[PDB]
Amino acid sequence: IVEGSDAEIGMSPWQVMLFRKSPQELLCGASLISDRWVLTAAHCLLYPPWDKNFTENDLLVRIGKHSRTRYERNIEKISMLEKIYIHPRYNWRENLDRDIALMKLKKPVAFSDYIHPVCLPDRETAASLLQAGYKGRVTGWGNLKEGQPSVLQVVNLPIVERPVCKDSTRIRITDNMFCAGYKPDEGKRGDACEGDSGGPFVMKSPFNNRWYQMGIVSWGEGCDRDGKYGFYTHVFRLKKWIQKVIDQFG
Amino acid sequence: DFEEIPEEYL
Amino acid sequence: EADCGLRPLFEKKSLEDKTERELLESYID
Ligand SMILES: NC(=[NH2+])NCCC[C@H](NC(=O)[C@@H]1CC[C@@H]2CC[C@](N)(Cc3ccccc3)C(=O)N21)[C@H](O)c1nc2ccccc2s1
Ligand code: NA
Ligand code: NA
Numbered sequence: 448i449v450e451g452s453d454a455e456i457g458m459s460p461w462q463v464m465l466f467r468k469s470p471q472e473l474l475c476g477a478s479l480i481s482d483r484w485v486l487t488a489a490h491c492l493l494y495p496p497w498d499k500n501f502t503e504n505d506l507l508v509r510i511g512k513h514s515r516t517r518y519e520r521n522i523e524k525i526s527m528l529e530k531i532y533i534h535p536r537y538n539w540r541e542n543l544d545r546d547i548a549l550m551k552l553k554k555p556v557a558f559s560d561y562i563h564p565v566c567l568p569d570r571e572t573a574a575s576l577l578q579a580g581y582k583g584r585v586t587g588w589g590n591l592k593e594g595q596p597s598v599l600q601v602v603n604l605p606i607v608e609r610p611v612c613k614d615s616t617r618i619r620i621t622d623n624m625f626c627a628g629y630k631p632d633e634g635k636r637g638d639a640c641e642g643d644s645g646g647p648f649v650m651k652s653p654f655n656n657r658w659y660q661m662g663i664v665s666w667g668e669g670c671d672r673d674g675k676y677g678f679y680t681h682v683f684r685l686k687k688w689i690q691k692v693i694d695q696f697g
Numbered sequence: 698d699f700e701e702i703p704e705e706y707l
Numbered sequence: 708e709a710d711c712g713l714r715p716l717f718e719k720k721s722l723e724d725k726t727e728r729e730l731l732e733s734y735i736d
Binding site for chain 1: 708710711712713714715716717718724725726727729730731733734
């Protein structure tokens with residue numbers, strides 16, 4: 448996260464760390480949607496161009512974390528994956544279209560002051576909130592500059608209109624994506640950065656006061672460059688697939 | 698840079 | 708979920724984090 452600030456304890460109880468057993472190292476962010484399901488970006492598990500291709504055995508899921516490197520004895524819970532599910536139509540070849548994957552935990556985690564799932568938007572919630580100018584919040588342990596924080600970082604960023612998004616890049620933008628960030632204008636900065644991948648973009652409903660995850664950190668070009676924006680997987684657009692997965696697989 | 702985690706985990 | 712998105716240390720105690728106002732004030736306050 449670029450130009451963010453340290454999160455408060457218990458601020459994003461759904462923040463998950465995707466952790467590599469060997470070498471032991473942060474892979475990506477992710478989020479808890481229930482006691483047995485974690486949501487992340489598919490490009491965090493499979494990215495052929497870079498020879499990335501994780502399996503269940505390869506990874507560890509760390510929940511209730513604050514410190515990046517410390518093992519938070521009695522706070523954090525570490526779990527095992529039972530199964531990874533990647534979008535059948537994830538497009539890693541061209542523009543990370545449909546960049547989403549579910550991870551099924553070996554056992555259900557227990558909720559605590561520091562552990563708690565985020566809500567998934569409903570068609571209605573998506574409609575009123577996914578609007579240019581509305582701010583969302585991104586969190587993560589990723590790079591501070593295009594180096595690594597000692598604690599979880601946070602930043603609030605506005606959603607940008609589809610045309611500004613498209614016109615900021617040469618990569619083809621699809622309906623499964625949205626971009627967020629300030630304009631060179633707005634004279635406020637911030638972005639996600641390398642290592643933030645798979646983290647949640649969330650918004651707080653003004654109607655029921657609940658936190659909803661609307662996007663997943665997907666991709667960008669550099670971090671916090673003027674005239675460039677962060678791109679997120681549009682979660683309500685892939686809601687159907689997620690449903691399908693959860694009730695067909697537990 | 699990561700602090701060591703317990704074995705029951707790996 | 709059911710209990711989703713209500714944070715044990717903020718919502719549940721009715722305490723606000725230090726920048727949530729910023730979000731809410733943008734959904735045009
Ligand atoms: N908001 C922003 N400003 N950017 C957010 C990026 C978040 C990172 N996502 C990425 O780095 C993703 C996955 C790899 C892909 C490559 C191209 C790029 N568009 C970056 C790029 C730009 C220009 C030339 C060449 C490459 C991109 O962001 N990618 C993530 O954390 C990572 N995912 C992976 C997956 C495997 C290994 C390492 C990482 S880091
Ligand atoms: Na373009
Ligand atoms: Na920018």
